[PDB]
Amino acid sequence: HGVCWIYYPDGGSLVGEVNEDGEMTGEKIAYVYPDERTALYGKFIDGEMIEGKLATLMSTEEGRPHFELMPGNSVYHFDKSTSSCISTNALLPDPYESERVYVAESLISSAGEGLFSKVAVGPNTVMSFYNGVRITHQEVDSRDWALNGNTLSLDEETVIDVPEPYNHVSKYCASLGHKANHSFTPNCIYDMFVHPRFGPIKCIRTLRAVEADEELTVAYGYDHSPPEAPEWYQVELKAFQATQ
């Protein structure tokens, strides 16, 4: 008759009354984001989100979460990408990400758009998700760098990509992590994340406090001595090494 909370290493969690087999199955299960406040509440089967409605975790009483549903009929479902499909709702934003980041012109010269904080946050804060289609390292490594601007290694078997035209916010805004530019003195890192809609992906997490309207940057981590990297990154590495 109790409630259970199961946390992922990234700080998100599933919460609810488990069934006889210890599974997160029911009509009142929730995924709670790492702010411990934004939640997707509703029907889950063995921890997979079937219909999660946007909610706010208002309090816990005896361990039991007390949610308030947000207005608007915002509903989400598990929707892991494939090699060819990035999302079934490319234009439906992630509600936690939408409160934390926006896209605008980068402050880095000739670097296109960048990702910026909406609000002040502390260290270790998950800001944005890096979802994309899932393809192999062989495909990515055997094609030209001009097609590999948005490729992010997930693990030894899978690379996440945001190919054209999903690199434009008008065609894809379900996640925004591909909009963060590179720096050798970054304020964020790529980190593993298990997302209830996107499945196992990576996120952008701050390494230190960031101010409102500060540009979020991450180290892209190309191999400097296999560098195997785009020319703009090669140029910047030589500059970084000279400051050191």
Binding site: D141, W145, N148, T151, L152, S153, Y190, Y220, G221, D223
Partner: peptide, 8 residues
């Protein structure tokens, strides 16, 4: 590899 963040 021609992707970000691989563990070398």
């Amino acid at each position: 590899s021609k992707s970000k963040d691989r563990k070398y």
